[PDB]
Write a protein that binds this ligand. Structure first.
Ligand SMILES: *[C@@H]1O[C@H](CO)[C@@H](O[C@@H]2O[C@H](CO)[C@@H](O)[C@H](O)[C@H]2NC(C)=O)[C@H](O)[C@H]1NC(C)=O
Ligand SMILES: CC(=O)N[C@@H]1[C@@H](O)[C@H](O)[C@@H](CO)O[C@H]1O
Ligand SMILES: *[C@@H]1O[C@H](CO)[C@@H](O)[C@H](O)[C@H]1NC(C)=O
Ligand SMILES: OC[C@H]1O[C@@H](O)[C@@H](O)[C@@H](O)[C@@H]1O
Ligand SMILES: OC[C@H]1O[C@@H](O)[C@@H](O)[C@@H](O)[C@@H]1O
Ligand SMILES: [Cu+2]
Ligand SMILES: [Cu+2]
Ligand SMILES: [Cu+2]
Ligand SMILES: [Cu+2]
Length: 495
């Protein structure tokens, strides 16, 4: 309902999404963060005005626009100390970028420390006037956006380092163990109408097993990539993933439970926890519908792109220009990738390159940056392992969509017609989730676990793609150049 040109004023305030009051982060004075929309190929101009006064949740901020390639605008990607210095409080900063060739469901979130868990996170929809699936549904609007999110009664820097959620929020509303009377979200449908629901995980940690009582879900989009329609009776959605599904409201007029079962914390539905309501003329009361066992769950390896696009490269292991393997580990309270743990450098990686850094060995942090050649095929394997606790780890690559040639829970490789997405579960020990992309987007791009508490503990690397062309391809506005001198002048209590 706002965008693609809009102010986003960030501030602190009290919120009670699950009937429990706590300080949090507001965007345009609301929680949860408001929906942003625009059309395929639009210019987005999002002026982030930072008015936060709470140091415990960080006064500074930085917003990542999740899913957007940001070609030519790497300075706008969001990750703190990779792509920019944070916006300092009392200041504003204009994100100004274009989305050529992209349409689907996205989201925006703080990409500073674990700040987005404290409430700076909202959905984005990029509509396609010529959406190949337009004819599959009648309704696609603000009312068909469904968000899932974990919620904590103690703030990110106040609770335990890897906390347990007190509530699942659906559209920013949910119940906790001790607030069984808190208002539930209601999604309204009219009988006989078909709905494009856009489901987005704003989660800081858990994945949700999502289903709707009595209804099947026709999945048509994954992480902004159009699919061949695939009908399931449930799906598992990892932090930061998006699915569009078509729901045919063809059941009896009634109330039906919408269910989102987390993989940790409260793993039931007692008292309407982990739930929202699908309401057709039906009475304004809770559903009393029953969960049927899932017999046709979403299986990632059975998803394919609408076009049937082959994976980049030739159909054999290591059949690409560069193949990398990321060996996960954990030691000293810190995650490692190939022995190195990510620590935010004081000079953002993008500025280091603009400043004359020529190679990965030059780039800080040492051991955490990988140089990638321009205009090439890349293959990255992310073998899951017990040495990295809190699996399954959903990994996200910035600036790119990738082919998932091998999915979690599958022993097979698909090079011919694999799903493409931008967040992938690396699964359980024994898995070897394997991705391929093309280096068509010069810049440093974060590659990290989207469990935010893991990223904070260093579960991340930086892909420095086509270093020689970074500066020329990504001219920076003066307001971006001013970020670091402003931030570095702040005393630590104001950060
Ligand atoms: C700034 O934000 C923090 C973290 O949200 C607030 O921390 C609360 O601190 C009080 C008193 O120590 C505790 O009772 C709460 O449990 C904390 N809240 C959370 C969500 O962890 C702090 O109060 C905020 N500052 C101001 C001035 O409002
Ligand atoms: C690390 C990588 O990219 N590919 C490896 C390669 O080094 C080797 O042929 C073998 C060792 O297990 O498995 C594959
Ligand atoms: C995963 O696949 C990569 C690339 O083929 C390979 O090098 C690595 O040994 C594999 N790891 C495991 C644990 O299977
Ligand atoms: O950090 C949580 C704290 O919140 C305060 O408001 C009190 O309720 C304390 O008993 C408690 O220790
Ligand atoms: O013995 C290990 C070596 O085995 C060879 O057959 C190749 O596959 C090499 O990539 C590998 O390093
Ligand atoms: Cu993200
Ligand atoms: Cu992203
Ligand atoms: Cu993780
Ligand atoms: Cu990221």
């Amino acid at each position: 309902a706002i965008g693609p040109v809009a102010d986003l004023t960030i501030s602190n305030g009290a919120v009670s999404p699950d009937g429990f009051s706590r300080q949090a982060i507001l965007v345009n004075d609301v929680f949860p963060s408001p929906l942003i929309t625009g059309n395929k190929g639009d210019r987005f101009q999002l002026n982030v005005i930072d008015n936060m006064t709470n140091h415990t949740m960080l006064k500074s901020t930085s917003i990542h626009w999740h899913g957007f390639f940001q070609h030519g605008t790497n300075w706008a990607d969001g990750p703190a100390f990779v792509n920019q210095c944070p916006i300092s409080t009392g200041h504003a900063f204009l994100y100004d970028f274009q989305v050529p060739d992209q349409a689907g469901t996205f989201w925006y979130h703080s990409h500073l420390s674990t700040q987005y868990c404290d409430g700076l996170r909202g959905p984005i929809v990029v509509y396609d006037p010529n959406d190949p699936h337009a004819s599959l549904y009648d309704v696609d609007d603000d009312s068909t956006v469904i968000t899932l999110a974990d919620w904590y009664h103690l703030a990110a820097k106040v609770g335990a380092p890897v906390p347990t959620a007190d509530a699942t929020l659906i559209n920013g509303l949910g119940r906790s163990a001790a607030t069984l009377a808190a208002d539930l979200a209601v999604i309204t449908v009219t009988k006989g109408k078909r709905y494009r629901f856009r489901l987005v995980s704003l989660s800081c940690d858990p994945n949700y097993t999502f289903s709707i009582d009595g209804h099947s879900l026709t999945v048509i989009e994954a992480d902004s990539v159009n699919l061949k329609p695939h009908t399931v009776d449930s799906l598992q959605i990892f932090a930061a993933q998006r699915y569009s599904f078509v729901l045919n409201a063809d059941q009896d007029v009634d109330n039906y439970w919408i269910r989102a079962l987390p993989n940790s914390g409260t793993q039931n539905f007692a008292g309407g926890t982990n739930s929202a309501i699908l309401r057709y003329g039906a009475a304004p009361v809770e559903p009393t519908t029953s969960q049927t066992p899932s017999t046709n769950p979403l299986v990632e390896s059975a998803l394919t792109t609408l076009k049937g696009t082959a994976a980049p490269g030739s159909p054999t292991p290591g059949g690409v220009d560069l193949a990398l393997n990321m060996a996960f580990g954990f030691a000293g309270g810190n995650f490692t990738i190939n022995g190195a743990s990510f620590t935010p450098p004081t000079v953002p990686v993008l500025l280091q390159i603009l400043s004359g850094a020529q190679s990965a060995a030059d780039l800080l942090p040492a051991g955490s940056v990988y140089s990638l050649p321009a205009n090439a095929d890349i293959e990255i394997s992310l073998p899951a392992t017990a040495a990295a606790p809190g699996f399954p780890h959903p990994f996200h690559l910035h600036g790119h969509v990738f082919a998932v040639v091998r999915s979690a829970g599958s022993s097979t490789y698909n090079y011919a017609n694999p799903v493409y997405r931008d967040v992938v579960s690396t699964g359980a020990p024994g898995d070897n989730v394997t991705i391929r992309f093309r280096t068509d987007n010069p810049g440093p791009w974060f590659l990290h676990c989207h469990i935010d508490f893991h990223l904070e503990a260093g579960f991340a690397v930086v892909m420095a793609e086509d270093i020689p062309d970074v500066a020329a391809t990504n001219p920076v506005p003066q307001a971006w150049s001013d970020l670091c001198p402003t931030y570095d002048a702040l005393s630590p209590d104001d950060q």
